[PDB]
Amino acid sequence: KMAFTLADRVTEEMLADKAALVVEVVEENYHDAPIVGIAVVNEHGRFFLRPETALADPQFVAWLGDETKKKSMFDSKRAAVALKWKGIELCGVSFDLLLAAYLLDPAQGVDDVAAAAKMKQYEAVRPDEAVYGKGAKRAVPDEPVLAEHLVRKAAAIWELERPFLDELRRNEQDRLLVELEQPLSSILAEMEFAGVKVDTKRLEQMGKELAEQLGTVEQRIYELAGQEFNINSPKQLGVILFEKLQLPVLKKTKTGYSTSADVLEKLAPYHEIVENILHYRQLGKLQSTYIEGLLKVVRPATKKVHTIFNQALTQTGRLSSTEPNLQNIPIRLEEGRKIRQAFVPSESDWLIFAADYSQIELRVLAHIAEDDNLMEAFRRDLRRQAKAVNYGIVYGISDYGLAQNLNISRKEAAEFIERYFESFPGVKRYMENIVQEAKQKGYVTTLLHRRRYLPDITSRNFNVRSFAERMAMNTPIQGSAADIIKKAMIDLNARLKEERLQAHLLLQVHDELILEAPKEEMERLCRLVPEVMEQAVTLRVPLKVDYHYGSTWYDAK
DNA sequence: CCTGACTCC
DNA sequence: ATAGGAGTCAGG
Ligand SMILES: Nc1ccn([C@H]2C[C@H](O)[C@@H](COP(=O)(O)OP(=O)(O)OP(=O)(O)O)O2)c(=O)n1
Ligand SMILES: Nc1ccn([C@H]2C[C@H](O)[C@@H](COP(=O)(O)OP(=O)(O)OP(=O)(O)O)O2)c(=O)n1
Ligand SMILES: [Mn+2]
């Protein structure tokens, strides 16, 4: 039904200057993962190649690394990184079907070729899950079955390129793919493969001291409670707090009494056990996640951790970070912040450099809402609890939420919101207009033409409709800020390279960039990094970047 | 596997 | 009813 050559050796007709290429890595975490199969589709035909054969072939390897030999792929970053671990360089990726699908509509959650193919009623390819199976049942099938699947995926990519590119052009999103997301993919691949070095000696010492403190807090809690119980079970905790100790029930969820941090905080005037419990649950998360969980994913020989930045997941155009997540390392409490002392440069006499956008989404909003008062404050170039309120309000917090938030009266909360929109009447207008626009069009868009569809926005159900309306208010701002830092990464890399600096990116944290570099390059970076980030886009307001460097991530403040 | 914790932006 | 976007963990 689909002819292909199950090849024993690489031939010339496989090395054309345009091809759909499949380099199959079946493990979800592709760092140092096996490549199980290769497929090439071009004008000359369809081929399957065994990886041990192809990857040890000097012409095939040469062809992968040749930028002028153009490849169309699905999830090229997965392939590029897996190939780096195999010591092979991949260049010339001209079309990425995953990223194409993602821009057309991030809600499809497209995560295999079959799911992208569905968008264009192309069905001559199976889903990966159907071929490999699930969980403990997962496995690479017999070679002829595997070969047909990889070929069918290459065929699908080969025939789907033009239809996807055609639709992107119609949406005015083709430049967003080719000039932004695709180049970013290569940059992210570099960061992931580079990894971040960890001071395991220090992290393990922190872990030993944390275990002692946990024990102390745990016993204190039992004493206060008059009983032992599992503090980490909201159910058992609920019984202690609301049945044994008879504290007021302020909130319930579908499964029982709430013990959220917000609720516990409000119960502080009733019993001191709630403050101990909050402390215990912080310490316990530090241990389970940022000591134990982090140590489990350190590569022992190099002491490096290699995250995967998911570039086609969030509904707003942000990245996410997994296994481990390096975008949520503690910072707000000194006790947790000390985890950052364990993230260190990968070479001696190198340093960590961290730069952060000031008030990014408020500046973006000022530009898009063209609010004179707000654009004014930033032209005059004018706290953690305040920041949360600022963003709360512009993004549609209610009087109830703000009151519960600042533990103030609802009346007072409602007044505050009213005066906030008086200080910034353009913002208010922008938010009423953007909702009406979303209702009329069925989607909202960002500065660089990223899109999010909101089919729920005219629901008759109040809850459903309201959530969609708040997405209409937030997505263009959060998403526009995502566009800006992404452009900034691309320009920064180019500027680092031409100036032949050794500095390279390690992490992006939504509106921060983290690099490491030889100590000699700090003065140069102090100028180069903020300049490029600030000049990424030009808005009606200024972009402002704060920066710091130090011996460890902790000290880069 | 889901829920409800803690963590970040 | 009750700002938005994320991931990992232990418990059940
Ligand atoms: N074919 C296109 C055209 C534009 N864009 C994206 C990337 C551009 O940086 C952004 C802005 O496009 P232009 O500045 O070229 O056009 P406008 O100035 O008119 O912007 P807009 O159409 O949003 O008003 O939109 C795109 O992805 N593909
Ligand atoms: N509670 C929060 C925190 C952050 N963000 C979003 C908006 C922020 O602008 C962006 C970046 O987070 P920051 O903490 O860096 O916020 P700022 O850039 O506004 O402040 P700063 O000047 O301190 O960097 O993420 C948000 O929506 N809600
Ligand atoms: Mn910032």
TrEMBL record:
<feature type="binding site">
    <location>
        <position position="511"/>
    </location>
    <ligand>
        <name>Mn(2+) 3</name>
    </ligand>
</feature>
<comment type="similarity">
    <text>Belongs to the DNA polymerase type-A family.</text>
</comment>
<feature type="binding site">
    <location>
        <position position="357"/>
    </location>
    <ligand>
        <name>Mn(2+) 3</name>
    </ligand>
</feature>
<feature type="domain" description="DNA-directed DNA polymerase family A palm">
    <location>
        <begin position="336"/>
        <end position="521"/>
    </location>
</feature>
<keyword id="KW-0479">Metal-binding</keyword>
<dbReference type="GO" id="GO:0046872">
    <property type="term" value="F:metal ion binding"/>
</dbReference>
<feature type="binding site">
    <location>
        <position position="175"/>
    </location>
    <ligand>
        <name>CTP 1</name>
    </ligand>
</feature>
<keyword id="KW-0547">Nucleotide-binding</keyword>
<feature type="domain" description="3'-5' exonuclease">
    <location>
        <begin position="3"/>
        <end position="169"/>
    </location>
</feature>
<feature type="binding site">
    <location>
        <position position="361"/>
    </location>
    <ligand>
        <name>CTP 2</name>
    </ligand>
</feature>
<feature type="binding site">
    <location>
        <position position="318"/>
    </location>
    <ligand>
        <name>CTP 2</name>
    </ligand>
</feature>
<feature type="binding site">
    <location>
        <position position="174"/>
    </location>
    <ligand>
        <name>CTP 1</name>
    </ligand>
</feature>
<feature type="binding site">
    <location>
        <position position="511"/>
    </location>
    <ligand>
        <name>Mn(2+) 2</name>
    </ligand>
</feature>
<feature type="binding site">
    <location>
        <position position="391"/>
    </location>
    <ligand>
        <name>dCTP 2</name>
    </ligand>
</feature>
<keyword id="KW-0269">Exonuclease</keyword>
<dbReference type="GO" id="GO:0000166">
    <property type="term" value="F:nucleotide binding"/>
</dbReference>
<feature type="binding site">
    <location>
        <position position="387"/>
    </location>
    <ligand>
        <name>dCTP 2</name>
    </ligand>
</feature>
<dbReference type="GO" id="GO:0003887">
    <property type="term" value="F:DNA-directed DNA polymerase activity"/>
</dbReference>
<feature type="binding site">
    <location>
        <position position="176"/>
    </location>
    <ligand>
        <name>dCTP 1</name>
    </ligand>
</feature>
<keyword id="KW-0227">DNA damage</keyword>
<feature type="binding site">
    <location>
        <position position="511"/>
    </location>
    <ligand>
        <name>Mn(2+) 1</name>
    </ligand>
</feature>
<dbReference type="GO" id="GO:0006261">
    <property type="term" value="P:DNA-templated DNA replication"/>
</dbReference>
<keyword id="KW-0540">Nuclease</keyword>
<comment type="subunit">
    <text>Single-chain monomer with multiple functions.</text>
</comment>
<feature type="binding site">
    <location>
        <position position="383"/>
    </location>
    <ligand>
        <name>CTP 2</name>
    </ligand>
</feature>
<protein>
    <recommendedName>
        <fullName>DNA polymerase I</fullName>
        <ecNumber>2.7.7.7</ecNumber>
    </recommendedName>
</protein>
<dbReference type="GO" id="GO:0008409">
    <property type="term" value="F:5'-3' exonuclease activity"/>
</dbReference>
<feature type="binding site">
    <location>
        <position position="318"/>
    </location>
    <ligand>
        <name>dCTP 2</name>
    </ligand>
</feature>
<feature type="binding site">
    <location>
        <position position="387"/>
    </location>
    <ligand>
        <name>CTP 2</name>
    </ligand>
</feature>
<feature type="binding site">
    <location>
        <position position="511"/>
    </location>
    <ligand>
        <name>Mg(2+) 2</name>
    </ligand>
</feature>
<keyword id="KW-0548">Nucleotidyltransferase</keyword>
<dbReference type="GO" id="GO:0003677">
    <property type="term" value="F:DNA binding"/>
</dbReference>
<feature type="binding site">
    <location>
        <position position="511"/>
    </location>
    <ligand>
        <name>Mg(2+) 4</name>
    </ligand>
</feature>
<feature type="binding site">
    <location>
        <position position="359"/>
    </location>
    <ligand>
        <name>CTP 2</name>
    </ligand>
</feature>
<dbReference type="GO" id="GO:0006302">
    <property type="term" value="P:double-strand break repair"/>
</dbReference>
<keyword id="KW-0378">Hydrolase</keyword>
<feature type="binding site">
    <location>
        <position position="360"/>
    </location>
    <ligand>
        <name>dCTP 2</name>
    </ligand>
</feature>
<feature type="binding site">
    <location>
        <position position="449"/>
    </location>
    <ligand>
        <name>dCTP 1</name>
    </ligand>
</feature>
<dbReference type="GO" id="GO:0008408">
    <property type="term" value="F:3'-5' exonuclease activity"/>
</dbReference>
<feature type="binding site">
    <location>
        <position position="176"/>
    </location>
    <ligand>
        <name>CTP 1</name>
    </ligand>
</feature>
<keyword id="KW-0238">DNA-binding</keyword>
<keyword id="KW-0235">DNA replication</keyword>
